[PDB]
Every structure is written in C-alpha cells, then in structure tokens.
Design a protein around this nucleic acid. Structure first.
Ligand code: MG
Ligand code: NA
Ligand code: ZN
Ligand code: ZN
Ligand code: ZN
Ligand code: ZN
Lengths: 162, 162
DNA sequence: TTGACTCTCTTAAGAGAGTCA
DNA sequence: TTGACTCTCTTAAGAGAGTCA
C-alpha cells in the first residue's frame, strides 16, 4: 500500500505536529540518588489535540492521515516506528514510554518493544541505579522500590518447607 | 466465615490439603550468578485436585467450605491471608507468587500485596542480585534481563530534545 | 479529508459467581 | 455437602475500528 516515501511523509507530519505540543520540563529520579530532567511534549487534555490527532480513550489517541482517498490510522505513539518490524520473538511490538508519561509524544521518549519489556520498565532502578535494559531507561521506573506488601509468606502449622 | 475461629479452621484445613499436594523441587536463579532451590506444593493438573478445591480457569482455582450450612468460597491462593486487610492504599490486595509458579500453593511462596507489587516481581534481579522488596523475593524474576527492544528513541527532524 | 466523539480488544499478573450432579 | 465444570471481571501497560457532518 503506502510507499516508503509516503510513510516517511506520515512520520514527518506527525513530528511537525507533535513538536508544537506544549513542552513540559520534569525533574525525575535516575537511580542512585541522582535526579535528571526530561522534556515531554504533551498532547492536550481535551480537543483540539493537533492536526491529525483524536482521542479514542481516556489516555489513548490515534493519528489519522488520508492518502489517495484512503483513510489510514495508527495508534498515536506508534508513528515513529512505522518503518520498523512490528513483532519480535512472536510478540507484538508496542510503543513504550521511557518517560512514563502517557500524554507525552516525544519520540525521544519512546521505544518499540514487547508488552512485557514495556511493563517491566515500571520497576527498573534506572540508568544510574542498575538498569540492564539494552535500550537504556531514561529514568527510574515509577514503581521501583521496597513495595508495600501487607503480609509475607507464613504458615500456621508445619506442613511446608520453603 | 465470620468468626476468627472459623477463619483459622479454614486456613488449617487448606494447609492440611495443600500440604499433601506433590512437592516439586525447582532450581531457580537468585541473581548474582547464584542458584537456589524451592519446593513448590503443586495442585494437580486435572481433577481431582484435593478436598475443597476446584478449577475455575486454565490456571485459576478456588477453595470452598460449607460453614453455617452456607458455601464460602475464595481464590485458592488467598486463603493464607484471610485475616489480613484486603486492600492497601486503596488498591486490592492479591496473592503474589514469590516462586512464579501458578500451580504452587505453598504459603511459604506467597505474599499479599497490590497487583503492581505482584507484577513487578517478574523483573526483580532477585535476592542475590539487588532485590529491594521489603518482603524479599525468593528468586530472580523470570523476565529480568536486557529485553529485546526492536527500536529505540529516534527522530527524523530536529524538533525534539530528551 | 478532517475532527470529535463512539465502541470493543490484548496481555499476564490477578479475581467473583453460576450450573449441574 | 462435595465435586467438576461453566461464565465473566480487574488492572495498567498497551491496541483497532465505526459514525457523522
Ligand atoms: Mg506474581
Ligand atoms: Na510503559
Ligand atoms: Zn516524555
Ligand atoms: Zn531499565
Ligand atoms: Zn512455589
Ligand atoms: Zn525482589
């Protein structure tokens, strides 16, 4: 269907539009007790969002372009990756926010990986705290830490060994 | 059921039945290049599972007892925690497998924590690799590692900064 | 061709409840 | 009373597709 040039044109129009989103400076934990700064390009909270953009869920959006009278639509964060393989190890590739900020559409804050890899970044100690992700995290995951476990392993009798 | 005595009786009956499940030894990564051994008490693959147990999904079971002439039923892994708060910080408490082995019902392999804490153990480096969980992991999470990211952050133009 | 809404679905860690015998 | 099945739901990281003007 769409040629390489046409896909590049979609990516370029998406970048043009997203680059005009409000740029918000966020101070973030990097791990190892260090703090860094990320600059997120945030889609607006309500319509209008930007040329080509529309909200399909509370924190879900799509990008739409009509080419040769055919409507094409993509998940709003998938556009930077339209020239990449869409699966790996038999798993669908997903847009994964390195900044953990759903509204952000900065392509420098996104990677393209399995949903498991994507989720796992929530708990990563971060680039200065021991991140082993080959595509390195930009920050410590928001859920990293000791947790809030209510009750640990226990037995009343003696039927079990660890 | 309602009374503490009745709850303790439920926990004791559950422990006695699960204590008769086959004990399967699993050698597991601990992190730091070290290996450990866990003894999982595994519910059978097919009926009969044990007194009070029935399968409600491919890897879901429930425990049921008749008390006060009424049937009381619980998720099969929730029984050790019947005297614990059922929520934390406004999040539902869940039975969480420290051994990452769904069929296992060894209460020494279970904790009671939010679904986020539960999920996050999948990526933990483990008790000899840097686990910071206050209720410590028994093994390195099965999904720990560098990942298989297909594409990293990138832009075609010059509109974005990290 | 475009905007602003609408709907349902996927995954993998977890749940509750009803139908029969 | 107990067993063995059936169904749908929750969450938070992610998706595709329809309607109307
Ligand atoms: Mg778990
Ligand atoms: Na993510
Ligand atoms: Zn961002
Ligand atoms: Zn990382
Ligand atoms: Zn186990
Ligand atoms: Zn841990």
């Amino acid at each position: 269907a769409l040629t390489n040039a046409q896909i590049l044109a979609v990516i370029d129009s998406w970048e043009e539009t997203v680059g005009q989103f409000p740029v918000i400076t966020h101070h973030v934990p990097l791990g190892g007790g260090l703090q860094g700064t990320l600059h997120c390009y945030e889609i607006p909270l309500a319509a209008p969002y930007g040329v080509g953009f529309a909200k399909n869920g509370p924190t879900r959006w799509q990008y739409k372009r009509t080419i040769n009278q055919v409507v094409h639509r993509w998940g709003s964060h998938t556009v930077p990756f339209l020239l990449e393989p869409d699966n790996i190890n038999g798993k669908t590739c997903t847009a994964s926010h390195l900044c953990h900020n759903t509204r952000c559409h900065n392509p420098l804050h996104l990677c393209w990986e399995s949903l498991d890899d994507n989720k796992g970044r929530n708990w990563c100690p971060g680039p200065n705290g021991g991140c082993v992700h080959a595509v390195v995290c930009l920050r410590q995951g928001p859920l990293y830490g000791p947790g809030a476990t209510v009750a640990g392993p226990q037995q009343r009798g003696s039927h079990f060994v660890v």
